[PDB]
Nucleic acid binder design. Structure first.
Ligand SMILES: [Mg+2]
Ligand SMILES: [Mg+2]
Ligand SMILES: [Mg+2]
Ligand SMILES: [Mg+2]
Ligand SMILES: [Mg+2]
Ligand SMILES: [Mg+2]
Ligand SMILES: [Mg+2]
Ligand SMILES: [Mg+2]
Ligand SMILES: [Mg+2]
Ligand SMILES: [Mg+2]
Ligand SMILES: [Mg+2]
Ligand SMILES: [Mg+2]
Ligand SMILES: [Mg+2]
Ligand SMILES: [Mg+2]
Ligand SMILES: [Mg+2]
Ligand SMILES: [Mg+2]
Ligand SMILES: [Mg+2]
Ligand SMILES: [Mg+2]
Ligand SMILES: [Mg+2]
Ligand SMILES: [Mg+2]
Ligand SMILES: [Mg+2]
Ligand SMILES: [Mg+2]
Ligand SMILES: [Mg+2]
Ligand SMILES: [Mg+2]
Ligand SMILES: [Mg+2]
Ligand SMILES: [Mg+2]
Ligand SMILES: [Mg+2]
Ligand SMILES: [Mg+2]
Ligand SMILES: [Mg+2]
Ligand SMILES: [Mg+2]
Ligand SMILES: [Mg+2]
Ligand SMILES: [Mg+2]
Ligand SMILES: [Mg+2]
Ligand SMILES: [Mg+2]
Ligand SMILES: [Mg+2]
Ligand SMILES: [Mg+2]
Ligand SMILES: [Mg+2]
Ligand SMILES: [Mg+2]
Ligand SMILES: [Mg+2]
Ligand SMILES: [Mg+2]
Ligand SMILES: [Mg+2]
Ligand SMILES: [Mg+2]
Ligand SMILES: [Mg+2]
Ligand SMILES: [Mg+2]
Ligand SMILES: [Mg+2]
Ligand SMILES: [Mg+2]
Ligand SMILES: [Mg+2]
Ligand SMILES: [Mg+2]
Ligand SMILES: [Mg+2]
Ligand SMILES: [Mg+2]
Ligand SMILES: [Mg+2]
Ligand SMILES: [Mg+2]
Ligand SMILES: [Mg+2]
Ligand SMILES: [Mg+2]
Ligand SMILES: [Mg+2]
Ligand SMILES: [Mg+2]
Ligand SMILES: [Mg+2]
Ligand SMILES: [Mg+2]
Ligand SMILES: [Mg+2]
Ligand SMILES: [Mg+2]
Ligand SMILES: [Mg+2]
Ligand SMILES: [Mg+2]
Ligand SMILES: [Mg+2]
Ligand SMILES: [Mg+2]
Ligand SMILES: [Mg+2]
Ligand SMILES: [Mg+2]
Ligand SMILES: [Mg+2]
Ligand SMILES: [Mg+2]
Ligand SMILES: [Mg+2]
Ligand SMILES: [Mg+2]
Ligand SMILES: [Mg+2]
Ligand SMILES: [Mg+2]
Ligand SMILES: [Mg+2]
Ligand SMILES: [Mg+2]
Ligand SMILES: [Mg+2]
Ligand SMILES: [Mg+2]
Ligand SMILES: [Mg+2]
Ligand SMILES: [Mg+2]
Ligand SMILES: [Mg+2]
Ligand SMILES: [Mg+2]
Ligand SMILES: [Mg+2]
Ligand SMILES: [Mg+2]
Ligand SMILES: [Mg+2]
Lengths: 147, 210
RNA sequence: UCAGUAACGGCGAGUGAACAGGGAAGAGCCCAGCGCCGAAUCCCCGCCCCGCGGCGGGGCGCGGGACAUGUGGCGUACGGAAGACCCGCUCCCCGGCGCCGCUCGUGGGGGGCCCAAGUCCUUCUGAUCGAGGCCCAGCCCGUGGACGGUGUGAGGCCGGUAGCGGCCCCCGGCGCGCCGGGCCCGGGUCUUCCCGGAGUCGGGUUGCUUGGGAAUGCAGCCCAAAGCGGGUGGUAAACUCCAUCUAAGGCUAAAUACCGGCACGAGACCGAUAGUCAACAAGUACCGUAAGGGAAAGUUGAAAAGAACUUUGAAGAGAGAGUUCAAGAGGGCGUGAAACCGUUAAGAGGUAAACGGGUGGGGUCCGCGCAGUCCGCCCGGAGGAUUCAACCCGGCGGCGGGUCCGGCCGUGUCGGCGGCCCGGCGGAUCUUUCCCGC
RNA sequence: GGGGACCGUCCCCCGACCGGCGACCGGCCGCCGCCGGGCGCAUUUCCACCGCGGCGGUGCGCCGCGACCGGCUCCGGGACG
RNA sequence: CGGCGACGUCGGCUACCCACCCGACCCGUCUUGAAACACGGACCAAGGAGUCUAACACGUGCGCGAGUCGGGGGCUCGCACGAAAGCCGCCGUGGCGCAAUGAAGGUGAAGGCCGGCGCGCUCGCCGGCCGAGGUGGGAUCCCGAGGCCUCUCCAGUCCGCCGAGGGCGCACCACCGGCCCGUCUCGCCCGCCGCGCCGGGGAGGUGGAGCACGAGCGCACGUGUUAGGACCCGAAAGAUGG
RNA sequence: CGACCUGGGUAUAGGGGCGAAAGACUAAUCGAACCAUCUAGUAGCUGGUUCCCUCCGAAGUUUCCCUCAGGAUAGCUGGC
RNA sequence: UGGGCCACUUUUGGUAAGCAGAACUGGCGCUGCGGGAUGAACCGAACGCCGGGUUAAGGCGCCCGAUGCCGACGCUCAUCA
RNA sequence: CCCCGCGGACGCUACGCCGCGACGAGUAGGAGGGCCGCUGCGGUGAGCCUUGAAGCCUAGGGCGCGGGCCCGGGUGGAGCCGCCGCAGGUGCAGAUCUUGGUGGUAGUAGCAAAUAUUCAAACGAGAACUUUGAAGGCCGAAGUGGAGAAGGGUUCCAUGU
RNA sequence: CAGGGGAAUCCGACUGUUUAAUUAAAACAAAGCAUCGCGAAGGCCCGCGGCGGGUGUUGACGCGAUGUGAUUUCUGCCCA
RNA sequence: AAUGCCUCGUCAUCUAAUUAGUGACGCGCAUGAAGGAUGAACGAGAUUCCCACUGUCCCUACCUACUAUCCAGCGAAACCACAGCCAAGGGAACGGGCUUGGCGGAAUCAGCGGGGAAAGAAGACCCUGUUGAGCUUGACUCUAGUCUGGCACGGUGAAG
RNA sequence: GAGCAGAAGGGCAAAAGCUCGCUUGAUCUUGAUUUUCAGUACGAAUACAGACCGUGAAAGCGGGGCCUCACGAUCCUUCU
RNA sequence: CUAAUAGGGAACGUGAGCUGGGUUUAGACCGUCGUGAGACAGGUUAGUUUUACCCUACUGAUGAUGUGUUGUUGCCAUGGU
């Protein structure tokens, strides 16, 4: 809605909000990121440190699928299965522990943020972290690996 | 000129973009046109499936999608050979065939030949001349049971084997997943240099004994 | 979508793909070569028949020519061929005779002609399509109340509009019996054979190009191949393993593009200095030697009914008269602003006008101005009339009622009698220890 | 692969008790109100008029005057310490 | 309380003309400074200048919420409106968010209280709990001695308000610890179908756009910046083809 | 009477021609013609920038810049 | 916005300057109003539209509001006061 | 336990209404409000209108701080507006602005290069300018003469206005 | 119709040409003088390109490139 | 000297008087040899003097033609914030407007050139711009053409 | 009233000056801070901490010069 | 020569008053400077001087207001001198 804008209020005021002294000129200071090392150096150094220069090794033909590896934390681990699975496991008299295959749910690596409930569980994953494996074993579970 | 905090922006509008702008006001018309063409094609191939030939089961290539299964371009020649369908006859009964796809394992091969056999059982082959049926099918079932299937023929579904809860054994509890992964990475990294050092040690052993 | 990413870049400004994934569409093939087959092949010219609708079929020719310096059939990297042995006879594509299902979201297309209902009553007007009405639940039709015309503003006055409405003419691909010709064996196993595109690849260098970075692609020049070879495997090189394809010959629909063209439909667009330059005898008039540049310009009225006739003047132009609802609409004529000008009326005037504040005078208008508001109660007087209250009958509402009686609503509560046949949908929960694929 | 079992939500019911009849409603009652018709026909009720009537509100057609009260202000007399 | 009231007068501070007193230089603009001997402006009419797209940032409104979003496609007589709307869910592919850190190989966010053991060796094998630590502030909330009542007192019935103190502490802030990745210094252990130039662990500093019971996603609106003709008009020039 | 004047026909075309030379002339244009297009070229520079009321209300200073008629930066401002 | 300028006082260069450059506070710029005849900056005072009262700085012969007080004391004559 | 009276103003668009106190300068600039204004769309006003829309004019009556608005009279002759939302090519005094029109200047500058006209008549409404006659002059054969090229293109010739 | 004349100084020898539209000159040109290149497979030059083209239907008494500027008289020194 | 700053050089001559002219001198700021110096004729070339001649002047007058002027007819343009009497003041430091004073009388005609810092043109001088263009050059970076080497076209025999 | 390398100022006496002896703290590291300042960088500097050392009997002192100046990003190169 | 041949201002008065000798465009020559293009408060030569009809001022020319109309003869405020 153009009826809600400053241009409707700026009718009758000669400079249209841009000043009488400095005016509204075409491109004072350059076009785009002009002069980022010369007369906009303070702005670039203040708000974008690290902007200029190269760091690291370049790698041609990066295929992101090769490095695709989504992760899930142990605090969200039990949400990959149904509520019924966890409840039945909790009230199960035997030592039968449910299997959570995180690859089926769409994750490859199991990270170890958060704590687990005190229920044995078999977790299938491509990769584990050290603390995730330790926390899975501490509740009496097991970590098995898939490819 | 930059103004306080912000994001360094790089718009790609330095190249007379206003001469090449693709508006989409013909998108609803295109949807209508494609829909009408689909309906006309389905009418044209009257009892044959609307979506087209049956496609094979195919596993997606890379490490990101290889847990997923989709429809392929066509059944391989090895699949058709061990299913017993001629490669030049399949395309007339509506089996797509990809002559350039090979089969690297037997599980995919067997899944696709079971797919071909199930389709061949589901097929209703009309006689070439309706008065005289040579070897096509029985008129009793082809008179009533012949209707145009909508959607893909036997759509490819991703099957997940259900894992029943089991008692964790002591071997599973004693398996060290993180250490196994780290040692496997190290072994794959150092396999070649270890072999070279073993060869050099063999040369050292023979020169020392000699 | 990846992705403003990998990468490129005075690594500055800036530039910048691909693969995988999801879809729209989906379709595959042909030579050369190697071989086999008595050149099996092709063009042309004559003569005969069937035809014409784009010129084909069939037949004859001691009729020409092309072609062994290679035509045709089989065959092409997915292997192929020939012999055997075994198995399956399974049925191709053309152009018509008559007729369907009449071809298709209910005609396939093109063309032509048609198909509902007020000009009813009273009125307004110059004219009306306006306003009021039209007993039976309401003027009439409505599968039609889009639109346009008509003297106003119309569903019913007219054209149209709706309709798996009607009639007529023409055109095109779809099945059956037959017609005329072609029309020739397919698969599986084994054996024996046969297998490929060269001044091309590749390398050097130069120039351009790309995101392609010790060189992505292209090209020039020079060098110049191989056959368990060759290409690619995004960091130059050597060795090694592996993966993947098979270059240097060819064809191919669909999805896709479309500011020119033919024909349509529509719009929260513009409304004659706007919108195309062009609503109009506009790429015109006109300008320039030429290339080229390039306008302005819409509106009487319902109907010309476009002012007969008289009169002055040489006429332009007038005064009368007349048409019209209106010429205070009179052919650049709807309305007809401002600037500017003429006249009339009022006022004023030696410090240029004009202006702010405050009064005064005059003028034009306004006030139904001109004996100045209404109304509540009470008092008095003079008059009317149903009837005032209270009771009776009937109807209707408001409120309340232990639920007085129901019907219930929320929340629990048991048997689940009741739902995977006699209710559903889900679950990453268990199973034949009844049943269809190892 | 089916077909079952179980679980979780549901959809209708058979039912007892619980809060309420609610802004989900009917029937009865009780009170109240209104309307219609009777009766009531006159010290009641209502209608219009008159008085230069009284009391209330707003307010005078125009031009004016006065009074007292209060707010602010400028002055002037008198008296006391 | 008085006067005056229809063809002459009554009221109308606005509005027309005129008179007088006081005040009053011509606007726009650049500028320290304009009435300027600074520039533009004879007059009138109509036209005439911060727009749209894309991308960000913050604020605000809405919906859903550890998710959110169908925008591309498809399905619904194909079509007055409707090129709209509706739907899909094994169309959520994908985007953004839910995880950071390192150049990379890669690695990748839970601790506290109470016990017996080695030597409770600045500590390894366990048990039991609880589930993101503590300090100082901290809206709100909770308790609360004691008071506030009636015609009066000896004696309890039920709750209302004030209330010194005390408590649990939201968000947020400051500080101290803790955890994750990089990198240094020191150091002793552990693991094994690969005993290795293998793998894991600890303590103390330090670098990170981190964690420490999520806040995002989509839509709309505003503002600001930017690329585009970019608020409007304006060069001297440069290039291509005639 | 001459390196004379002049008609017509021809030739030379734009970074080119032609010049007894003045940067002269090349269609009233020449120290680079004219026409159309790229092109709405760029401008830190000049001019302009359209309704009302209410509330708040500056700066001409610091640092850096081939910076000195401009910017970024801090300050001063407003809004939430 | 990033051209500033002015005044008291301090202060540098300059013979000086309505010159150039600093410090401090105020002002003008952005600001009208009373006074200084006139005037960006001086003196007083800052502003919504009004009535009454009273002041500031400045004035009170006439212009021009106000001394038209029987104002007080002196000084001064200018043929450029 | 209100009852000879059965009765008792207004209010409270809660985005409303009421009370009290202080305050009010403003360029550049920012913000809010706008029952200010323009054009179009979705709703709504059982809106308005040929018994007169828009537009325009007006010494007419008023309202609002204002932007502006309403009403009367005239002219005009066919369409228009209010409210709730939506959307902009949305408001002009300036730009040596664009296009169009119109002033003062101003009945002014001017209609002054190449010697020069005059008398009578005719036609005619009308004669300094046309035609005829008479006179006086000029070009003075390198012409103000008679013919062509280029260029123009019907200007040539009659008749009429 | 139809020359004012004389004595000198500077510059250019003369005649010629020149900035159309402010400069007619002392500027340019000129004959004369001097230098340079070239024997054609060449000199100088054009051309995007062709063994293309101009000089050239030419041949050193000729083409091409420069300077100075009639006559007369001289034209010195310096190759760092 | 068309070349000399100092310089109006010094001397002579020309005049009453000469920053002029001519002749001469020459340590010549900074003359000079393919250009130096001469020399007839020539020149719409620059300069000085003399004779003659004259309104150039003393010192102005008069006459003629066409205008201007007045009239009939016809009929523009430039320019224009508003306009138009001054003195002083202060002020963007030179006012038509403002302050204080002087004062101010319709409508006009022929002239005139003091003002309107009159009109004409977005100053050409000067500066600025990270705006150009024409030209030059051992400015930076290139380039046509040319010189040279190499490979190819590109072969057959001998001698060294 | 000398000297402390240099400009000047400050500072300094069994010193910071002069002469000897031994040495390489002019070394290897992480942070914090000060100065200019926008509280950015560079440069320079201060106080620490961890190594390894020097000197001295030791306390200690020293990671350059008594203090105030003596210097340098991205990209590229080179070395470790 | 004369009495004397004083000094000045008025946008260094006065270019829609003139002139154009000078400086200060484009042509050209010399000297100096510069490699060169080119430069020289060095010299020399040739080089377009536009508009008034508006307002005012000034010069002259008609007129105008007032005394009823009109005419004759006069006075002198003021200004010049
Ligand atoms: Mg403002
Ligand atoms: Mg500025
Ligand atoms: Mg598809
Ligand atoms: Mg992304
Ligand atoms: Mg590119
Ligand atoms: Mg063959
Ligand atoms: Mg009909
Ligand atoms: Mg109609
Ligand atoms: Mg109709
Ligand atoms: Mg029809
Ligand atoms: Mg590699
Ligand atoms: Mg038009
Ligand atoms: Mg119009
Ligand atoms: Mg006429
Ligand atoms: Mg009319
Ligand atoms: Mg008209
Ligand atoms: Mg009039
Ligand atoms: Mg200006
Ligand atoms: Mg100035
Ligand atoms: Mg001004
Ligand atoms: Mg001035
Ligand atoms: Mg000027
Ligand atoms: Mg200017
Ligand atoms: Mg104008
Ligand atoms: Mg002007
Ligand atoms: Mg307008
Ligand atoms: Mg849709
Ligand atoms: Mg996904
Ligand atoms: Mg706390
Ligand atoms: Mg901490
Ligand atoms: Mg921002
Ligand atoms: Mg523009
Ligand atoms: Mg250029
Ligand atoms: Mg020249
Ligand atoms: Mg332009
Ligand atoms: Mg720099
Ligand atoms: Mg400026
Ligand atoms: Mg100063
Ligand atoms: Mg300012
Ligand atoms: Mg202020
Ligand atoms: Mg002020
Ligand atoms: Mg004052
Ligand atoms: Mg004074
Ligand atoms: Mg007052
Ligand atoms: Mg006074
Ligand atoms: Mg007085
Ligand atoms: Mg004195
Ligand atoms: Mg105030
Ligand atoms: Mg204010
Ligand atoms: Mg506009
Ligand atoms: Mg205008
Ligand atoms: Mg304006
Ligand atoms: Mg005249
Ligand atoms: Mg004349
Ligand atoms: Mg004669
Ligand atoms: Mg002739
Ligand atoms: Mg000559
Ligand atoms: Mg000579
Ligand atoms: Mg000439
Ligand atoms: Mg000339
Ligand atoms: Mg001349
Ligand atoms: Mg000679
Ligand atoms: Mg010569
Ligand atoms: Mg020599
Ligand atoms: Mg001389
Ligand atoms: Mg003389
Ligand atoms: Mg001499
Ligand atoms: Mg010589
Ligand atoms: Mg004056
Ligand atoms: Mg200028
Ligand atoms: Mg200019
Ligand atoms: Mg600059
Ligand atoms: Mg240049
Ligand atoms: Mg060079
Ligand atoms: Mg240390
Ligand atoms: Mg004198
Ligand atoms: Mg002068
Ligand atoms: Mg003058
Ligand atoms: Mg002049
Ligand atoms: Mg001169
Ligand atoms: Mg000159
Ligand atoms: Mg001359
Ligand atoms: Mg006198």
């Amino acid at each position: 809605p153009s009826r809600l804008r400053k241009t409707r209020k700026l009718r009758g005021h000669v400079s249209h909000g841009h000043g009488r002294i400095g005016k509204h000129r075409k491109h004072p200071g350059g076009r785009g990121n002009a002069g980022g090392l010369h007369h906009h150096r303070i702005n670039f150094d203040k708000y974008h440190p690290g902007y200029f220069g190269k760091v690291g090794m370049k790698h041609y033909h990066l295929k992101r699928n090769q490095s695709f590896c989504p992760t899930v934390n142990l605090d969200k681990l039990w949400t990959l299965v149904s509520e019924q699975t966890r409840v039945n496991a909790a009230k199960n008299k035997t030592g039968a522990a449910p299997i959570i295959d995180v690859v089926r749910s769409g994750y490859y690596k199991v990270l170890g943020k958060g704590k687990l409930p005190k229920q044995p569980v078999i977790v299938k994953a491509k990769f584990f972290s050290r603390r995730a494996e330790e926390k899975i074993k501490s509740v009496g579970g097991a970590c098995v690996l898939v490819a | 000129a930059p103004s306080r905090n912000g994001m360094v922006l790089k718009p790609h509008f330095h190249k007379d973009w206003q001469r090449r702008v693709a508006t989409w006001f013909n998108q609803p018309a295109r949807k209508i046109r494609r829909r009408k063409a689909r309906q006309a094609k389905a009418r044209r191939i009257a009892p044959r499936p609307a979506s087209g030939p049956i496609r094979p089961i195919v596993r997606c290539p890379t490490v990101r999608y290889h847990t997923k299964v989709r429809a392929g371009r066509g059944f391989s020649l090895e699949e058709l050979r061990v299913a017993g369908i001629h490669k030049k006859v399949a395309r007339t009964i509506g089996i797509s065939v990809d002559p350039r796809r090979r089969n690297k394992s037997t599980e995919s091969l067997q899944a696709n030949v079971q797919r071909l056999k199930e389709y061949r059982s589901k097929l209703i082959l009309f006689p070439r001349k309706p008065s005289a049926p040579k070897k096509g099918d029985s008129s009793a079932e082809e008179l009533k049971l012949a209707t145009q299937l909508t959607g893909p023929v036997m759509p490819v579904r991703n099957v997940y084997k259900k894992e029943k809860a089991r008692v964790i054994t002591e071997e599973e509890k004693n398996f060290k997943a993180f250490a196994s992964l780290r040692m496997a990475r190290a072994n794959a990294r150092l396999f070649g240099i270890r072999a070279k050092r073993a060869k050099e040690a063999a040369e050292q052993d023979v020169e020392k004994k000699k």
